[PDB]
Design a protein that fits this description.
It is found in: Nucleus; Chromosome. GO terms for molecular function: aminopeptidase activity; chromatin binding; endopeptidase activity; histone H3K36 demethylase activity; metal ion binding; p53 binding; peptidyl-arginine 3-dioxygenase activity. Keywords: Aminopeptidase, Biological rhythms, Cell cycle, Chromatin regulator, Chromosome, Dioxygenase, Hydrolase, Iron, Metal-binding, Nucleus, Oxidoreductase, Protease, Transcription, Transcription regulation. It catalyses: L-arginyl-[protein] + 2-oxoglutarate + O2 = (3R)-3-hydroxy-L-arginyl-[protein] + succinate + CO2. The protein is an alpha+beta fold. The chain is 17% helix and 30% strand. The chain has one domain. The chain has six helices and twelve strands. Helix 1 links the parallel strand 1 and strand 2. It starts with a strand and ends with a strand. Bound molecules: 5-(benzylamino)pyridine-2,4-dicarboxylic acid and manganese (II) ion. Manganese (II) ion binds next to loops.
């Protein structure tokens, strides 16, 4: 079944019906008028960030460094040879002029943490970037600015059917390939219930703390995640 969509729910409505019980929801009408929604093009990103060094994941992922200009030329526009992903980078601490184009969702103030401790990551890459099914240790607002993303969500109650890796460093990551699972090795995965959605520009997906999520970009995509408690 699909993640529910609510237009600008009250802080109390969000707190009681989603944050406290830990239920995913897509928030409409919240981020859809942030300046990033109309301003962020490849052209704007190149103008404001082109010459800055960014970390890039190259898909068995390896990690390298290059300028934003280099990243767009090699992994976005010029019939890329491999998949490059400007992933989980605090681009707005590096480039404060870009932080003017976003805000922190008001719903974050329902958390128990300081606003200064909210981690804001950029997720900028071509069509076809894929995450492993994984869980994070904080709440998350994932804001879609450019393009769409297909996302699959499994509650923490279903962890047993997701076969987490046995190593400590990877215990938060599933061994299963969500979209082509090995049911001979991971048979419990097939009957695990889940929510899914296509997240589109202007929309905010609330991923509850420790909720397992899987993310595949359907187009050239730019997302901003807010990790908060
Ligand atoms: O908001 C999040 O918590 C979040 C969003 C994404 C995302 O892709 O948008 C994500 N993917 C991780 C990844 C994917 C491909 C290569 C290397 C890392 C992880 N976490
Ligand atoms: Mn994540």
């Amino acid at each position: 079944s699909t993640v529910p969509r609510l237009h600008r729910p009250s802080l109390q409505h969000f707190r009681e019906q989603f944050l406290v019980p830990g239920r995913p929801v897509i928030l409409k009408g919240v981020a859809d008028h942030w300046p990033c929604m109309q301003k962020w093009s490849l052209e704007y990103i190149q103008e404001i960030a082109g010459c800055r060094t960014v970390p890039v994941e190259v898909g068995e992922w390896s990690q390298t460094l290059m300028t934003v200009n280099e990243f767009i030329s090699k992994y976005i526009v010029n019939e890329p040879r491999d998949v490059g992903y400007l992933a989980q980078h605090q681009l707005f601490d590096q480039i404060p002029e870009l932080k003017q184009d976003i805000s922190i969702p008001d719903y974050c103030s329902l958390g128990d943490g300081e606003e200064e401790e909210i981690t804001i990551n950029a997720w900028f890459g071509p069509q076809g970037t894929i995450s492993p099914l994984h869980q994070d240790p904080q709440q998350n607002f994932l804001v879609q600015v450019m393009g769409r993303k297909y996302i699959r969500l499994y509650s923490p109650q279903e962890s047993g059917a997701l076969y987490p890796h046995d190593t400590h460093l990877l215990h938060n990551t599933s061994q299963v390939d969500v979209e082509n699972p090995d049911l001979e090795k991971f048979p419990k995965f097939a009957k695990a219930p889940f929510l899914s959605c296509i997240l589109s520009p202007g929309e905010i997906l609330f991923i509850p703390v420790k909720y397992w999520h899987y993310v595949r970009a359907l187009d050239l995509s730019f997302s901003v995640s807010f990790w908060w408690s």
